[model samples]
Target: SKGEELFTGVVPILVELDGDVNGHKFSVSGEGEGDATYGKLTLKFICTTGKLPVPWPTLVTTLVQCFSRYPDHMKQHDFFKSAMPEGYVQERTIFFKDDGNYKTRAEVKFEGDTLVNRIELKGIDFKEDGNILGHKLEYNYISHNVYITADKQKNGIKANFKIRHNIEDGSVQLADHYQQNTPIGDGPVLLPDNHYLSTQSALSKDPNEKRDHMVLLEFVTAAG
Candidate 1:
């Protein structure tokens, strides 16, 4: 039925946090789910010192605003255009929630159309590195896998990878480790049916602020 074209099922994602937030031992696991695909699928897993400055709702809105402002950032990429001839659209609101009291759990949600891939986070470990804001800071998550399902037609679909930050400072895009200015590097290569994007290492320059502040943010995709 046409309904099938409009709605796809959700993929469950589990994220476990074990490490220190400013030298304080913390441990918990998060369970979340996301849409399989809407022509294109992007699954991102982020672990930071504290909540992002921007709230979840605003983060999605700002993302749409950013896409509208740029207009051609992803427009010129055939890889993305192939998925959404109408251009990229959020399709559904993404969400992040503290599942229990005292930051015991983290939850995320996304909805879209069709199932072409599945994204999940595994073997996640949050550990303290050095001193920051007068205490040892939690650097980032240890590991995760970005899995994509190749279509029946070989090379019919592909994926691009990137890293985004929420530091208050103005500069961020430049510091993104996996960012690709050229679409060729984004996804010109073919992906196996079971291929996964692996992130080896990522370092962040935490914003320097006199008073401690928390940043709370949600992930969003502004494409059709």
Candidate 2:
């Protein structure tokens, strides 16, 4: 429960996402660097045509295949956007979408002493035309039985995403902090914290700090 590593080696994580995508709506491409136990990754895009394309689905169910999925070497843990400490934030960057650049970045370090895997991920906020997607989009979650359901190919939808995992001795992979048949609809939706993304975002900063209304996301990862 204390010392562990998600996987040991120079590993590579490849995310090939594509579904019944239509009209080349946005440009899509991804990549990374370094060895397995430590490295960097990037997933980004813009409209392939640079011309206004048809609207895409709210979510796409593309297959997420991993080369060395690293089921063999795994460490998992729970982290949050709100609780991220100053120096604990190893590294991060923003890829503004309007300027036609939205970059996702990360870095890792292994603490041999405490056996902790430290990782840092850039905040999510891409400007398309430029814009998205925000507000306490963060929430808390459990990882024990975590798994993501890919969008149906024929559903004709799009997608949103990103996450940086911590895998060290006794560490584990993070889960999306969400679930299947979770929620979706104009009337109302759901968040991993069981609050409306809007509602959570609206959570007033209490003077008493009595109500634990802080919303954060939880992701699950494979652990040893």
Candidate 3:
């Protein structure tokens, strides 16, 4: 329960995502409700091109295969990177449905459990910069007051904040790089020196059907 109050229960935590870091702005928040905490809580980044390779949920769902393959995968410090197929093509059977190809537009990093480079994903092959960096949640978890402040231009995620003080809340630990590691055009490129990790806090006990969808995935996969 050390990291619970920061992300679980009904204590209420308000976060602001309007400020620009580097040159990006996005917004969303999280509370301690189990449903919202596990299934609904998200980190979103605004996109401009408005064309996504596929639905964000679809991508997350489909990535389940790779997520299982490497288990605690460490890539550029985020789950999205962790779920990436080491080869990028349809290497394994996934849960979500869609064409087996997509592209990425960010370079994320992690410097030993700390933030290094801000990871941003955009569309590919587009000339105009209208392509937006979409929200494909890579991680979620618990923490205490975060003293997260370090920028390694050379700190390379080539590695991969918290949002509270007296209040109850969690912080985010971002990885590094703005990757062009294309091929989700069909798959992915091996971005150099990447690190990744996912974090979370159990909000409460659920009544089977009431559990977070991902939790349900646990049992579903087990039964099969």
Candidate 4:
């Protein structure tokens, strides 16, 4: 088995994630990877406004519906085919509640020869200021790096998936608050050498608030 090629073409991968923050629920999903040399993932968000307004309810909902029907409508177009890498797929979903329960499912496939993964995300953190409407809410998820390498024994892969993110606490202006990455919660996930096929769950609790964050991850191998 060591000398034989395990799999060819893109190794299909599926990632599902469900989470809640301050009671707002959401989810993410997607797929990618080709012969372990390179890969990509695209996630979708489907959310509902618990007690929120405007963009929170209609914006997310309408976008969600549009994305849900995207593949069927866009797949045949030359633009769609040329934009993505070989053997790639995308799917995602999200949900939200007034209690701040956010749930989401996300699928991700990763591959590359360099053994390095770089990712970044940014957004706005909306806070209701009693009767106040229309205020700038901005946040950022800076460079997230995951180092990965294949085991020497031709068994599996080892990786460090760590993420650090933060928000501006007191800035009243959007540009000022969004410029720097403060510190909120950061941690590392260590995956040791042991071959493929693994599943794990993670949970984090907020000390200042009675809230819980949960996550699940699974890994599997393919051979041809």
Residues 1-224, model 3: lDDT tens digits: 11212222222212211222223333222122122133222222222233333222322211211121112232223222332222122211221111122222222222232212222222222212211133332333233121111123422122102211111233222221122122232332223333222323222223453312222121000000
Q: lDDT of all the models against the reference?
A: 0.26, 0.22, 0.23, 0.23
The weakest ten consecutive residues by lDDT in model 4 span: 176-185
Q: What lDDT score goes with residue 160 in model 4?
A: 32
- In angstroms, give how far residue 147 of model 2 lies from its true place: 2.6
Task: Provide the TM-score for each candidate, comma-separated.
Answer: 0.25, 0.23, 0.21, 0.26
lDDT (tens digit, per residue) of candidate 1 on 28-80: 33333434232222223333444432222111111111111112333332222
Error (Å) of candidate 4 at residue 12 is: 2.8
TM-score of the candidate numbered 2? 0.23
Give the C-alpha lDDT of model 3: 0.23
Summarize candidate 4's per-residue lDDT along 47-127 as a digit string, tens digits: 222222312211111110001111222222211112122211222222211211122221122333211112111122434
Least well predicted 10-residue stretch by lDDT in candidate 2: 194-203
The clash count of every prediction, one per candidate, is 10, 41, 37, 32
The local lDDT score (0 to 100) that residue 111 gets in candidate 2 is 30
